[PDB]
């Protein structure tokens, strides 16, 4: 009954190292991996950026843990609907029960690279929710043709297709986009926030899963969330700056293209504006309690980002420590196929 | 040292079936695995098409197997070229030493989906040209920036790279194709064909190679053949023509763009139209003979697509009989950074 | 009273042969044509591709057969909607009630030269269904403008019109074009194929037409047959596989773009792919019975293209001993204004 | 040898009337046909416009004459340069040293109706000059590709073909392009103007076509000039009022695109503003001396139109009283294939 | 009590004078000006067209007088709508109660020079009709998004705003666009024409107005004529013929590109054709009687452009002889905010 | 030593363009002697909350000073202005001022161009952008009828036929080394923003460099900066007037890209005065204003065109005009934007 996701950040670590920690922390009660899809890290100091849906078919055959996208825009710029379809039917064709499709409206960090013009938010999310259904089209496992305003797909089949196609996860932070989940899709991804924003964001999903006839208690809610843990409070501190300055980035990211735009904005992040947006403690103890307290508001799953490059004291600590406490409700749903 | 290429069919089997049979053939001695990169089979009756992208992860962290991609369409249907560089990089980082990027001009088969403009092969090859330009700069490891006819790329720097990159093979019948393959990466990759068509693409090749003042003696010429074995000769017979009919179609294929369009073409396919593109019999020295005839001609790899279903039978038959006597010469440059 | 279309067959013959053979047909008991709209035949060995609109003036200038085109895609690669209303208005001023204008979805064989997005199936009957709407709108003869999703026409009006729009007739084996042929259109042309497919495709014209309140009855229903008649069975076969693989071909062939496609493609060809698809025989008696039978399932015109290179023979014996043998509905309607 | 053009005004004139005048101008005396290629009439009271290559096939089966367009645009509005290269092809292998294929840029009247951006005279130079590297291509009898600025062509093939291709005649009145026209063409068409005028655009044909190593003396230059004969000078002054405005606009023209425009613009033409483009008079000798004059100043055809409905009786007049009288040079090129 | 509107032709005359002379009209009694916002003149003898919203600046800073765009078209060659938005804003921030946005769907005069697509008339008049939504949604001070057939607008609102916004006034000779502009705009600009076409605008205006719950009474009726007065009769026709023979070019103009191509047509242009068009006498009795009938029709607010280069002679006629004459009803409502 | 002067920047950004028409008006009786005006559509916050249209402004600045003025910058790329307009503009501004206006151009930020909704390329695409909307403004100043086509611009038949004597000077607003150099090698004068002293020498190397080897003679170019002060009465208020009114100026880094007011206005809330440092002098000191212009002037700067970031604009302008100007020593040669 005890489990924590592991949040492995792809803007930091080379492949072959998330890898490895994840074999650990299967090891030590971490039970699902939330991986990045990005091409660019937000910062040179980060310094990775593997090519997730490799990394994933590596993590599928040599554990037994759930693992998702968090999250892959299927807009049309880096990937295309259909293909990010196919990957994701192949993955749980793989390792079935274990995947789950998160997906979202994107950042112009990673995805200015093929030189279109860049939406602004709300007709991003309307991109977003027509691949949605070139998705779920495509996950019917019949020929099937579309036409809408942003994709054009020819007649398209997923000849490789599990018994059951795996969940459709979306990760936002809007109102609006929350409750569309809720609507269209199987479950929600956000990311840390106050307590009013979560409970906003859960209201909203749980409201468009009900207008559209679905019972949302059987839908995953997840919460993707910064820490850092070290030694010291100071070193703590110290690797939030160095590692995570955008966790300070108390505002709307999605039009800075480059790395260097934001390694020029790191300047500015000061230990303050990471309050509610990192916990930076020594304290494992006060690690459980942060944890605890968003499994009472409602998350059914959280996925945990250590911010420093002590990713295997990180993992390690966490197993022995705060793993084992966190008191989850018997029936919570997670992200996976019925 | 003994080795041989196991051609990985993501047309017909199941992506879990094909982990497991990589891994039975290294233990038979295949050294190699080639991955088709298809968004549909050639038919329904062949039935698959796995993303091979997250495939290939697996076969990565399971087995000590080189693999490449046989070959992946990078001029931006599917596929646009930053994204093929960083799954490239990617691999290659993870599995350092056993990756090779294979690319190639691409079919309707697999790019029409996307619902534009199909090209005339002659342009695709451009197309194709620029996309290695593309994930050349790519592989530098520097913020790049290119505007050409084809591909718009912003600033863009792969930061997940390994030491050394993986060898880009071109998979190319085209004699044009071949020489600027020659020119432009760092192999070749063709399928099986009658011996003066083999002989043009090697020279080709090795033109191209040596105008560029590069040494092609040691660039991987590599050649991807289909045969059918099986317990008796009726029913190789009966499995290509089951399984691959599209084997027996002599004549360009990369303009049609429903399995269901093969599927209804395939009626016409007999015995007699395989002559030359898939070896049918269950004798296996004369395997062994095909196989060996093709290095002689100078392909330092040979990567084997049995198109029957028996593939565990085929692997293990290959293992015992056929991979132990074919003779390598000892240098021959294999795909591999 | 005896009749029989002439099917005048643009990828194999020069337009002066056309010309004169149709000059020929109409003596022999012929009183319509079907003049196929190419720019490329289907193989070189075919070997033509008349422009068939200039073809068509001369034909009414020295004939007074009945003509169509089988089929004109009007859906803006080769030609603008507006040209193909504009050409079938002038044929029809100048030859009153002799010119009905044979309509389609077309194939990349001939679209691909303009280098241009080719569409589905299903797209092209939508982008077919708008060409029809101004082809409709040009025909009132007043100043109209459009504006759909794939045509735009600026103020526009044929000033040279006849007192009567030519028929448009759709040429198309689908059964929901079928239906809005009825529904839109003023007549169906489809091709030779088994009894069941025709009957559908009937049924589905006459549901289309009822629905929009016209009466079928009086709405022709065409049908164009490959043939091959000859001295002997032998030479009959022969030269369907030689001048006509194409007949053999039972899949779907609009994505094709080049004859060498095709023609790599004939190699396959034999002569049990033909069944259904050509008639070849020496037997007349057989050729009348195949024609009649087409008659009584309810078509009101036939079109026959004899495949051989052996145009006049084919003409003299089907004048002597098969038109005057085909009994004709004394009510039946033909393609005229 | 006596002979002269007769210029076929499908603005005007049904294309069965066409047919039999045509007929006729051959039977007195006429030995060629320019035939407009246009979609609308100038204004409604001219009242038609045949499509022009249907009308041809029919007056190469019924006549020996030669004929051509005066002229096609192949600039892929109305026509992609392909078909006419094809529909050229088709009528000279008909109708063997007959027919002359030609070209020009276009007016907007025609072109416009395909909802189109319509460029600067300038811009539609270079259009055609590509337009002809297309049809010449074409006209090589190979497999074909193409692309440049304006057209794309896919491997293409005229597969019906005369042994000897028609010549590419281009109608302008630009001295840049009637140089182009000497280098990369056959012949020049120009409309009747000034003596000045015609100078220069000989001049400029000439120099291009030697520039290119052509001998211009073996190669045609033809005019279509507008004439009004009638029974009395009041009743031929009368008829070009009414029919032909058109010819009293000495302005730019190919930028109006509705015949209700030029109709309007009629209202404020009058006789003094056919000076020098358009002949009134029933003086079948001052006809001849006109007609003589152009020979004189270098041009190999002429193909007159009259400008009146009266076209039987203008045909039979001419037939009678001056097309015997016709001095032409005994060599002179006439537009027809080698 | 005494009033009439000065035309500023930018066609004719340098801004300098323009501006100067606008000075003199307000001592003179004139108490608002109409300015051509141009790119080029009708003809290269009219010699100038300065940038209108440059020079409003100066107009507004140097007189109290009223002023206004007659016409700028914001359908996005030279100007996008939001940009007029700005302009117009900007204008009547500086000079509330002062400015009045005049608009209209374009010529080819001046839009042909950004080399795009030119739609017919009445697909200008749509995209006319949707520039009027985005300016109405700029007005409104709010940041606004808008997604048309013709214009794209994201996340735009004018900071610097007027407390009340400038009236919109369309100008059209249209019966259609005269309706729409009574339904969705603030007032009506029409130019001169004969009493019945004039009755017809006016009616379809009210129509529009009414069937909106508008009432029409209390909406500007504006017109703009042109005149030419000289001090004899024969120097006040030899002016309109020199100086504006587009005056006398009844047939519809949008589509005409150059200068050039009027100058050409300019050669027919005689004085009949300026009758209803353009006043033509020293007798400045009658210019009153013309005006007055105008007035009597009712027009609101008359604009008048002499077309003569003695513009200051011009001016000082008018103020003497015929502005103190001219009797307005008390109530007519005038552009400017409410 | 010239005679004494200075540059007046008015922050349409800030304020309603008829306080700035009044403050350059008393600007002028002060000692200033030219003006730059920002064009822009949007503020960078709400607090700042303007956005005047500068060119029907200019016209009004024009018709009631004699002060020279010029647009800091106007983006002529065809996002809110296509370049054929803005030579209109430029053309008419100095036909009516001639000798005054100096046309400023840049390669434009989404703060004010994303209204549009078009592919905003990345900086180093807009300057080739900029470089051929260069050249439809120098064809279109010839006065002739000119086509253009290129990669970005199409210009069909086209003609100025209002135009001064003497073309206005087109000067570059970048802080790009690369188009420094293009700069000085393609226009007649370089604008560029206060940075340190590192930064302003390679980009006035750059824009020296340029000129020459296109033959033209630097020393008589004008090289142009723009600086953002805060002053007021005490050096407390000139701290708070800079972080609530100008929190942009605390933002070293590329700006080019954020489209929204509160896009920046969220960035603000991490600005602190610290940040300001070389980018915003805050002080009440005015002989420490006096040194700071001086400095500028001593590097090689031939005009400075000042910017006080408080809302004290008319205090601003008595107090340099007593205490700042006069004391300004400027070289007697020193080349100002102005047409020939
Ligand atoms: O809350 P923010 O700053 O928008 O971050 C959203 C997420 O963005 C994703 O790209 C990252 O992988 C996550 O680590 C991050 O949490």
Known sequence: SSRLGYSA????????????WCQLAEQEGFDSVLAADHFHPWTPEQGQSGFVWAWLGALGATTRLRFGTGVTPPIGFRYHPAIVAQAA???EAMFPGRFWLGIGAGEA??????????????????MLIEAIEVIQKLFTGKVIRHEGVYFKVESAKLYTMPDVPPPIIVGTAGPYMAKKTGQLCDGLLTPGANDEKLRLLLSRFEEGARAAGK???????????????????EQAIENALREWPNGGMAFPKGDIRNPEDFQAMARLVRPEHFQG????????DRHGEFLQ???????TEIYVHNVGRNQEEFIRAYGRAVIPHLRWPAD??????M
């Open 109 to 126: 960090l990673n995805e200015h690279i093929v030189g279109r013009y860049w939406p602004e938010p709300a007709e991003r999310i309307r």
């Open 89 to 91: 039917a192949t993955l």
């Open 293 to 299: 307290h968003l499994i009472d508001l409602g998350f």
């Open 332 to 337: 919570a749903p997670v992200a996976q196929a």
């Open 277 to 284: 947006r990192v916990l930076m403690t020594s304290d494992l």
């Open 9 to 20: 950040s792809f803007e930091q670590f080379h492949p072959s190292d998330l890898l490895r």
């Open 215 to 233: 019972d949302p208690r059987r839908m995953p809610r997840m919460i993707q969330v910064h820490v850092s843990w070290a030694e010291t409070d």
